[PDB]
């Protein structure tokens, strides 16, 4: 009601918009400065003799011969091995809750990397050495949704917030190839390769993922009841019985350790053109993909 | 350069912690035994000279 319509009706009485009466937005096209005329010619902004006017001053960091600042500081391994450190995109319980409240992540089904990427909840960069998402606690007080969520790292307080609401959380490892596939399935399927096996963690990560306190995906299921009970005592909530819930079957869904996608096995070829799936039946191949 | 009176020597903890420290002593003096604070065990213990680091 106003300026909006006031512009289109103001256009009715103006000459036709053509290729002859266009112009850039004021302030968008700064003028070029050319070395011509009194102000900008003559020495042309370059000063008088020396190295600078002749374009031959030394490189960046050189100080005229004094041992330069960036060389006289001692080497220290601030950045040593930076390229082999694993990084985890943090997912907040504020951001997770927001994604569910806006309908971009569906809590009625299991939530793994594919659902978070497809809901545009996190952006994963395996080429920048991302190893998955770390579930961080920020927003734990106001988190109410019950989810079955699979991440790579999770804080105890983040786990408590999930499990206090009746949800389930498991931590699962993805190797960089498996991670790239799980993050963008369609581009991988357009390679026409059999679905590979998800590799195991490296040794240094085997203790994390075989530990029930982290809800590790290689951890002993019989040890989970105790660990879930400990956080409830620690943080002062009553552990719900999720076996009594109607979504209990959904809450129990976990990929096999060697499995990248729910419902698809290693060694299958997805034929998106014909909407078919090709399964090998050769024994040697079949033994390879189940091992 | 030729003149030399003192030397730098390493004093290792007798507490077995592996803690070491450096002190100067007269070259002609005898090997040093000292009571020095050892942070690993958090108490003063004996240290014995082991090696001359350099000449001062």
């Amino acid at each position: 009601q106003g300026g909006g319509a006031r512009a289109l009706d103001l256009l009715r009485g103006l000459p036709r918009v053509s290729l002859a009466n266009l112009k850039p937005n004021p302030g968008s096209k700064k003028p070029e400065r050319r070395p011509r005329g009194r102000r900008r010619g003559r020495k042309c902004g370059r000063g008088h003799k020396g190295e600078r006017q002749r374009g031959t001053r030394p490189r960046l960091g050189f100080e005229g011969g004094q041992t330069p600042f960036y060389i006289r500081i001692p080497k220290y391994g601030f950045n040593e091995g930076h390229s082999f450190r694993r990084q985890y995109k943090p997912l907040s319980l504020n951001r997770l809750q927001y994604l569910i409240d806006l309908g971009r992540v569906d809590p009625s089904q299991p939530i793994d990397l594919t659902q978070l990427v497809n809901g545009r909840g996190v952006t994963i960069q395996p080429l920048k050495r991302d190893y998955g998402v770390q579930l961080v606690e920020e927003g734990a007080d106001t988190f109410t949704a019950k989810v079955n969520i699979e991440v790579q790292l999770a804080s105890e307080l983040a786990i408590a917030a999930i499990e206090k609401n009746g949800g389930v959380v498991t931590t699962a490892f993805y190797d960089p190839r498996s991670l790239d596939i799980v993050c963008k399935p369609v581009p991988f399927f357009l390679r026409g390769q059999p679905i590979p096996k998800r590799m195991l963690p490296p040794e240094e990560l085997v203790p994390y993922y075989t530990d029930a306190k982290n809800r590790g995906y290689l951890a002993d299921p019989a040890k989970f009841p105790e660990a879930r009970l400990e956080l409830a005592r620690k943080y002062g909530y009553i552990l719900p019985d999720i076996t009594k819930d109607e979504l209990f079957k959904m809450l129990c869904t976990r990929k096999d350790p060697r499995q990248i996608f729910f419902g698809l096995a290693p060694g299958w070829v997805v034929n998106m053109a014909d909407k078919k799936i090709l399964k090998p039946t050769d024994e040697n191949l079949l033994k390879y993909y189940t091992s | 350069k030729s003149k030399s009176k003192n030397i730098l020597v390493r004093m290792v903890s007798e507490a077995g912690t592996g803690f070491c420290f450096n002190t100067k002593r007269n070259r002609l003096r005898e090997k040093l035994t000292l009571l020095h604070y050892d942070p690993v065990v958090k108490q003063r213990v004996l240290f014995v000279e082991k090696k001359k680091i350099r000449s001062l």
């Binding site: 490189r59 960046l60 960091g61 600042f69 960036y70 060389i71 006289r72 500081i73 001692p74 080497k75 220290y76 391994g77 601030f78 950045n79 930076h82 450190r85 694993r86 990084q87 985890y88 995109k89 943090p90 920048k128 991302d130 770390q134 790292l153 | 730098l8 450096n22 100067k24 680091i53």
Partner: protein, 95 residues
């Protein structure tokens, strides 16, 4: 500096800088102090302690170290158990 590489037409990082300085995402650079491992026998404990600090660079040095490193070295990282993680963002800083 290499402003344009012969193979990629790209500016190159001065690797001397990477081996000596830490870039925090906020744009601060952290160095060790020169001489913190030299002739400790003649330095007082107060001086030795000063020499062991990790210290910040001034604006001029920061601007210089920014120009000698490419964009990769300014990205936010999410290293697990990064000792410097809390130092990447500023708090209560006015002007």
């Amino acid at each position: 500096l290499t402003y344009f590489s012969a193979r990629k037409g790209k500016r190159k990082t001065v690797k001397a800088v990477i081996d000596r300085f830490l870039r925090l995402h906020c744009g601060l650079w952290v160095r060790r102090k020169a001489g913190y491992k030299k002739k400790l026998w003649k330095k007082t404990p107060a001086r030795k302690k000063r020499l062991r600090e990790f210290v910040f660079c001034n604006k001029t040095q920061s601007k210089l170290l920014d120009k000698m490193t490419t964009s990769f070295w300014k990205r936010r990282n999410w290293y697990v158990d990064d000792p410097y993680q809390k130092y990447h963002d500023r708090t209560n800083l006015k002007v």
